[PDB]
Enzyme design. Structure first.
Site, PDB file in Angstrom:
ATOM      1  N   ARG A 144       0.830  -1.185   0.000  1.00  0.00           N
ATOM      2  CA  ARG A 144       0.000   0.000   0.000  1.00  0.00           C
ATOM      3  C   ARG A 144       0.873   1.246   0.000  1.00  0.00           C
ATOM      4  O   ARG A 144       1.651   1.468   0.923  1.00  0.00           O
ATOM      5  CB  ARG A 144      -0.947   0.002   1.209  1.00  0.00           C
ATOM      6  N   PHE A 180       1.127  10.547   2.109  1.00  0.00           N
ATOM      7  CA  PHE A 180       0.790   9.981   3.414  1.00  0.00           C
ATOM      8  C   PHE A 180       1.877   9.010   3.898  1.00  0.00           C
ATOM      9  O   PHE A 180       2.671   9.340   4.789  1.00  0.00           O
ATOM     10  CB  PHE A 180      -0.574   9.278   3.324  1.00  0.00           C
ATOM     11  N   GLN A 222       3.420   1.474   3.099  1.00  0.00           N
ATOM     12  CA  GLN A 222       3.275   0.379   4.061  1.00  0.00           C
ATOM     13  C   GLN A 222       3.741  -0.965   3.506  1.00  0.00           C
ATOM     14  O   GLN A 222       3.441  -1.312   2.361  1.00  0.00           O
ATOM     15  CB  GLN A 222       1.813   0.276   4.503  1.00  0.00           C
ATOM     16  N   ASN A 239      -0.897  -1.690  12.590  1.00  0.00           N
ATOM     17  CA  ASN A 239      -1.542  -2.600  13.522  1.00  0.00           C
ATOM     18  C   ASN A 239      -3.046  -2.709  13.289  1.00  0.00           C
ATOM     19  O   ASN A 239      -3.616  -1.980  12.472  1.00  0.00           O
ATOM     20  CB  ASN A 239      -1.245  -2.203  14.976  1.00  0.00           C
ATOM     21  N   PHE A 292       5.050   1.091   8.430  1.00  0.00           N
ATOM     22  CA  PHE A 292       4.912   2.086   7.378  1.00  0.00           C
ATOM     23  C   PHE A 292       5.968   3.174   7.489  1.00  0.00           C
ATOM     24  O   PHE A 292       6.533   3.400   8.565  1.00  0.00           O
ATOM     25  CB  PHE A 292       3.491   2.688   7.346  1.00  0.00           C
ATOM     26  N   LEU A 296      -1.450  10.189  13.986  1.00  0.00           N
ATOM     27  CA  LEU A 296      -1.122   8.794  14.287  1.00  0.00           C
ATOM     28  C   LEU A 296      -0.483   8.605  15.668  1.00  0.00           C
ATOM     29  O   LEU A 296      -0.338   7.480  16.134  1.00  0.00           O
ATOM     30  CB  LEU A 296      -0.223   8.192  13.199  1.00  0.00           C
ATOM     31  N   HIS A 331       0.029   4.409  16.770  1.00  0.00           N
ATOM     32  CA  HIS A 331       1.056   3.605  16.112  1.00  0.00           C
ATOM     33  C   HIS A 331       2.396   3.856  16.766  1.00  0.00           C
ATOM     34  O   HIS A 331       2.786   5.006  16.971  1.00  0.00           O
ATOM     35  CB  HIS A 331       1.118   3.942  14.618  1.00  0.00           C
TER      36      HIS A 331
HETATM   37  C1  78E Z   1      -1.291  -4.645   9.918  1.00  0.00           C
HETATM   38  C2  78E Z   1      -2.545  -5.158   9.176  1.00  0.00           C
HETATM   39  C3  78E Z   1      -2.859  -6.608   9.586  1.00  0.00           C
HETATM   40  C4  78E Z   1      -3.711  -4.147   9.350  1.00  0.00           C
HETATM   41  N1  78E Z   1      -5.035  -4.597   8.918  1.00  0.00           N
HETATM   42  C5  78E Z   1      -6.203  -4.323   9.518  1.00  0.00           C
HETATM   43  O1  78E Z   1      -6.301  -3.667  10.554  1.00  0.00           O
HETATM   44  C6  78E Z   1      -7.464  -4.872   8.852  1.00  0.00           C
HETATM   45  C7  78E Z   1      -8.198  -3.799   8.021  1.00  0.00           C
HETATM   46  C8  78E Z   1      -7.296  -2.731   7.384  1.00  0.00           C
HETATM   47  C9  78E Z   1      -8.075  -1.606   6.703  1.00  0.00           C
HETATM   48  C10 78E Z   1      -7.165  -0.770   5.836  1.00  0.00           C
HETATM   49  C11 78E Z   1      -7.272   0.563   5.730  1.00  0.00           C
HETATM   50  C12 78E Z   1      -6.401   1.359   4.899  1.00  0.00           C
HETATM   51  C13 78E Z   1      -6.516   2.694   4.811  1.00  0.00           C
HETATM   52  C14 78E Z   1      -5.617   3.549   3.946  1.00  0.00           C
HETATM   53  C15 78E Z   1      -4.950   4.689   4.742  1.00  0.00           C
HETATM   54  O2  78E Z   1      -4.345   4.235   5.951  1.00  0.00           O
HETATM   55  C16 78E Z   1      -3.448   3.223   5.960  1.00  0.00           C
HETATM   56  O3  78E Z   1      -3.063   2.601   4.977  1.00  0.00           O
HETATM   57  C17 78E Z   1      -2.942   2.947   7.378  1.00  0.00           C
HETATM   58  C18 78E Z   1      -1.730   3.885   7.670  1.00  0.00           C
HETATM   59  C19 78E Z   1      -1.031   3.529   8.989  1.00  0.00           C
HETATM   60  C20 78E Z   1      -0.723   2.021   9.023  1.00  0.00           C
HETATM   61  N2  78E Z   1      -1.961   1.255   8.806  1.00  0.00           N
HETATM   62  N3  78E Z   1      -2.623   1.518   7.584  1.00  0.00           N
HETATM   63  C21 78E Z   1      -2.500   0.372   9.674  1.00  0.00           C
HETATM   64  O4  78E Z   1      -1.976   0.122  10.752  1.00  0.00           O
HETATM   65  C22 78E Z   1      -3.825  -0.320   9.275  1.00  0.00           C
HETATM   66  C23 78E Z   1      -5.005   0.260  10.098  1.00  0.00           C
HETATM   67  C24 78E Z   1      -5.235   1.753   9.906  1.00  0.00           C
HETATM   68  C25 78E Z   1      -6.019   2.234   8.831  1.00  0.00           C
HETATM   69  C26 78E Z   1      -6.224   3.623   8.664  1.00  0.00           C
HETATM   70  C27 78E Z   1      -5.644   4.525   9.580  1.00  0.00           C
HETATM   71  C28 78E Z   1      -4.862   4.043  10.654  1.00  0.00           C
HETATM   72  O5  78E Z   1      -4.292   4.904  11.546  1.00  0.00           O
HETATM   73  C29 78E Z   1      -4.668   2.661  10.820  1.00  0.00           C
HETATM   74  N4  78E Z   1      -3.855  -1.734   9.599  1.00  0.00           N
HETATM   75  C30 78E Z   1      -3.530  -2.733   8.785  1.00  0.00           C
HETATM   76  O6  78E Z   1      -3.140  -2.562   7.630  1.00  0.00           O
END
Ligand code: 78E
Length: 164
Positions: free
Chosen positions: A54, A59, A62, A101, A112, A121, A125
């Site tokens: 991603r 931003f 990841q 997370n 990320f 954040l 995080h």
């Molecule tokens: C580690 C992994 C197993 C984990 N997965 C799950 O929790 C299941 C659903 C995910 C939904 C995804 C949303 C994606 C949204 C796009 C924009 O934000 C991101 O990309 C964030 C940036 C900080 C690091 N991060 N993803 C994550 O840690 C994201 C959660 C998140 C989303 C949006 C904002 C945020 O602060 C945190 N978590 C994950 O990627």
């Protein structure tokens, strides 16, 4: 005292450049050690050959899902997800390295790299490092992302290890 590790980034298999990171082992020893060991591959698994699943321009980038390669997987060196160690360090600007997370105390291997100041954040995080050299390479990686995060080419960690 604080490890330096590197990623050699490739775009569809062609070398883009090297990004190196200072890991803040003096402030978050457990989180730093996890990333360090996954970067050397010393346990028999880790980041080498994995992809950034991603990338959202403006931003963050990841990565770290070396088990399923789609953003659902990854695993820590601790045999289970681990606690949020502390929230001493903040998301102060581009280059900040921080744990992805799925809620409180669910740290695995996904991380990320911020490409802007992302103070919202903080406290959610765990920050555990920062880019030392090659921020330009991380910026270039953004070329291959999009608004929803899907990448237009395969962005991989072709090699990685510890420098110090
Ligand atoms: C580690 C992994 C197993 C984990 N997965 C799950 O929790 C299941 C659903 C995910 C939904 C995804 C949303 C994606 C949204 C796009 C924009 O934000 C991101 O990309 C964030 C940036 C900080 C690091 N991060 N993803 C994550 O840690 C994201 C959660 C998140 C989303 C949006 C904002 C945020 O602060 C945190 N978590 C994950 O990627």
């Amino acid at each position: 005292v604080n490890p330096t590790v590197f990623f050699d980034i490739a775009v569809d298999g062609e070398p883009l450049g090297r990004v190196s990171f200072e890991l803040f082992a003096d402030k978050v020893p457990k989180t730093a050690e996890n990333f360090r060991a996954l970067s050397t591959g010393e346990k028999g698994f880790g980041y080498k050959g994995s992809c950034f699943h991603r990338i959202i321009p403006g931003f963050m980038c990841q990565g770290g899902d070396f088990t399923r390669h789609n953003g659902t997987g990854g695993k820590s060196i601790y045999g289970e997800k681990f606690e949020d160690e502390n929230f001493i360090l903040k998301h102060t600007g581009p280059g900040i390295l921080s744990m992805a997370n799925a809620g409180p105390n669910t740290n695995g291997s996904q991380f990320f790299i911020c490409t802007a100041k992302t103070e919202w954040l903080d406290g959610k995080h765990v920050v555990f490092g920062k880019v030392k050299e090659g921020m330009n390479i991380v910026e270039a990686m953004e070329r291959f992302g999009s608004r929803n995060g899907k990448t237009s080419k395969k962005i991989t960690i072709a090699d990685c290890g510890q420098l110090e």
